[PDB]
Amino acid sequence: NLRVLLDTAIPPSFCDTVSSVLLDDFNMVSLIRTSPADSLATIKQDNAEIDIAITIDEELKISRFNQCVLGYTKAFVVAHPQHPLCNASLHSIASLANYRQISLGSRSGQHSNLLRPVSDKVLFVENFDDMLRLVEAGVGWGIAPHYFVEERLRNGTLAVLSELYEPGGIDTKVYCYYNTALESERSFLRFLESARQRLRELG
Amino acid sequence: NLRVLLDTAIPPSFCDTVSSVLLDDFNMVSLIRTSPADSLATIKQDNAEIDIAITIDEELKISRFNQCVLGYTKAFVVAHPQHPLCNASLHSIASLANYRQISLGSRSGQHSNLLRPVSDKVLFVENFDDMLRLVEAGVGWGIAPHYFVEERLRNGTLAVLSELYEPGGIDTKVYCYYNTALESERSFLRFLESARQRLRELG
Ligand SMILES: N#CCOc1ccc(OC[C@@H](O)Cn2cnc3ccc(Cl)cc3c2=O)cc1
Ligand SMILES: N#CCOc1ccc(OC[C@@H](O)Cn2cnc3ccc(Cl)cc3c2=O)cc1
């Protein structure tokens, strides 16, 4: 039995070739979605017994878990197209620390340096749907993955603010936290190659 | 008078088209090299009066300085080709926290999450030359930028360890910290485009 955790920041298209790869080698494979904000908190629970976590969230060393980089993926800062700074420049990008942010909350009230909110006026949600609902309704601005925002950007229901900060969108590493056991395993090596190959194709 | 700080992690080839761009707009331009480990510590000193810092080091917010991403650049973990884990796998990559690391030190004894050493057995230096001297002499392993390591990798005087962690080498963002003053300036916007254009060409 192999258990795999995928934070909601990872495109669901990723989970395709990946899950196929694992089934050739492993006979039972369990896939768990979680908020990026809960990804690492979850695998630290001993009882949870996750073998592999695939999340954008970072920490320097977890107990009995090694880390490596599968690839890279783009998030964007998005708001209502009539938001106070809807198209304003690098000036209004400093100002985001003043305007209301819609951030992922976490079961453990704590947030990593990466995922911690930037502004004082913050309002927490559990998932990127709940996030972009409030952001579509001008309640605030938020950072969501490409795959969530591509749809609504076409339709002009949402506007990007990040481009002057990071053109192409905000590149962020996809990490793979694996039980130290899987380290000397041909099984895992084979999954790593495929998983990496995969994320390359999505940009 | 414009003052610009470039950490030693930035290729010196970058500083070419960049310095040219600034001179069209600005009439006096001063370029300062510094250790990545001293980059941010230096601009926080009020008396230093840096207008623009270009460094790989990250912090969520400095006083009276906005941040943005110029581009991306690759560092590699390097050691002696006969180092205990000279070609060993993802197992020996966990083990780096045990073997002696050669790390950049800092005037302020403190290090950011990014640049802080990973292992217990650490030995500090001021620059990447002093680093790769000790690493060529098998004293330990270290993380240096591509441009420092390309030379010695050809010659087989150094070996890579990072590939199983991050194939292609360890991607790291080049940040641009700028005095909030430069925000509403055509001068700076023009430099940003060129500087970004530049780093794209180096990979
Ligand atoms: N303008 C402009 C750009 O300046 C910014 C720099 C960092 C930011 O972080 C906000 C943080 O509270 C949440 N956060 C972070 N980094 C993420 C990366 C990927 C994904 Cl999928 C989500 C997040 C996220 O949800 C915000 C603005
Ligand atoms: N195997 C393997 C790979 O796993 C590692 C992950 C992070 C590491 O950081 C070491 C840190 O003490 C210094 N450090 C960091 N990140 C850098 C990025 C760019 C540049 Cl130019 C230098 C550094 C650096 O000098 C080491 C290994």
Descriptive notes:
- With 203 residues, chain A is of the alpha/beta class.
- Chain A has one domain (1-203): D-Maltodextrin-Binding Protein, domain 2 (3-Layer(aba) Sandwich), CATH 3.40.190.290.
- Chain A contains 6 helices and 9 strands; from the N terminus they run βαβαββαββαβαββα.
- Chain A has helices at residues 14-25, 36-44, 90-94, 128-136, 146-154, 186-201; strands at residues 2-7, 29-34, 52-55, 65-79, 101-104, 122-125, 142-145, 159-160, 170-179.
- In chain A, strands 1, 2, 3, 4, 7, 8 and 9 form a 7-stranded mixed β-sheet that branches.
- In chain A, helix 1 runs antiparallel to helix 6 (186-201).
- The longest helix of chain A is centred in the C-terminal third of the chain and has 16 residues, at 186-201.
- The radius of gyration of chain A is 18 Å and the shape is elongated.
- The A-B interface holds A 60-61, 66-69, 72, 89-91, 93-94, 97, 113, 116, 118, 164-167, 170-171, 173, 180, 183-184, 189, 192, 196 and B 60-61, 66-69, 72, 89-91, 93-94, 97, 113, 116, 118, 164-167, 170-171, 173, 180, 183-184, 189, 192, 196.
- Residues 9, 56, 75, 77, 93, 96, 103-104, 114-118, 143, 145, 161-162, 165, 170, 172 of chain A line the site of one copy of the ligand N#CCOc1ccc(OC[C@@H](O)Cn2cnc3ccc(Cl)cc3c2=O)cc1.
Helices and strands in order, then pairings?
The structure is a homodimer of 203-residue chains.
Chain A: E1 2-7, H1 14-25, E2 29-34, H2 36-44, E3 52-55, E4 65-79, H3 90-94, E5 101-104, E6 122-125, H4 128-136, E7 142-145, H5 146-154, E8 159-160, E9 170-179, H6 186-201
Parallel strand pairs in A: 1-2, 1-3, 5-6
Antiparallel strand pairs in A: 3-9, 4-7, 4-8, 4-9
Helix pairs in contact in A: 1-6
